[PDB]
Design a protein around this ligand. Sequence first.
Ligand SMILES: COC(=O)N[C@H](C(=O)N[C@@H](Cc1ccccc1)[C@@H](O)CN(Cc1ccc(-c2ccccn2)cc1)NC(=O)[C@@H](NC(=O)OC)C(C)(C)C)C(C)(C)C
Lengths: 99, 99
Amino acid sequence: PQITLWKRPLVTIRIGGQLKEALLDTGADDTVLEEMNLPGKWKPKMIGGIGGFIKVRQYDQIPVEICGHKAIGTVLVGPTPTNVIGRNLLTQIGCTLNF
Amino acid sequence: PQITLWKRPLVTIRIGGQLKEALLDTGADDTVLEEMNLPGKWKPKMIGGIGGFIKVRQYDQIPVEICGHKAIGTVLVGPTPTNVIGRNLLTQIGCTLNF
Ligand SMILES: COC(=O)N[C@H](C(=O)N[C@@H](Cc1ccccc1)[C@@H](O)CN(Cc1ccc(-c2ccccn2)cc1)NC(=O)[C@@H](NC(=O)OC)C(C)(C)C)C(C)(C)C
């Protein structure tokens, strides 16, 4: 689809068979999800945004379906105020910026 | 142009007569540049992201040329980790997300 930018580019994603709303974010290297208790091993990581760094849990090889397009990769879980889909998954679904 | 996301979508901008590099950032409501001088009056503002809030200077009605496309809008200046072009200006240059 084409998503205009008049409002926040929030779309429905599926993770663990369950649905969430997340921001398609070209300004994000990584995918960062609101706290959720995923199973499996994780690694601690620190990621930085506008206000500084937060502690997140790094889960690898997590399937995430974005607006019907399938992806699989690293998902960071922690105290973010919004679910963010970053470039690591946006590339997998063939997302471009266009003007 | 069409811009893919295997790398950060960095572009050259022209502002206050100077060239800079900034990140096309669909996850940003606002446009935020590293500390610099801009002409005219500004207002103290706060903006928030991952990691928390920062103090910025709000400059209104500032012309900025983004890859040769013109915009005139609000530019925030402060201790952002990196220069970002947000939706307020991406909409002005006709930028959409496509997949
Ligand atoms: C309604 O609030 C916003 O729109 N907030 C925006 C904002 O923070 N947007 C975030 C996503 C977001 C939106 C709303 C609430 C919380 C988070 C991003 O669009 C822009 N931001 C811009 C940004 C970019 C880079 C960096 C950075 C950090 C460390 C080292 C180098 N760069 C910091 C901020 N990117 C990041 O923070 C990413 N950081 C990143 O990719 O780091 C490499 C994350 C996400 C992976 C953490 C601005 C403050 C930029 C206006």
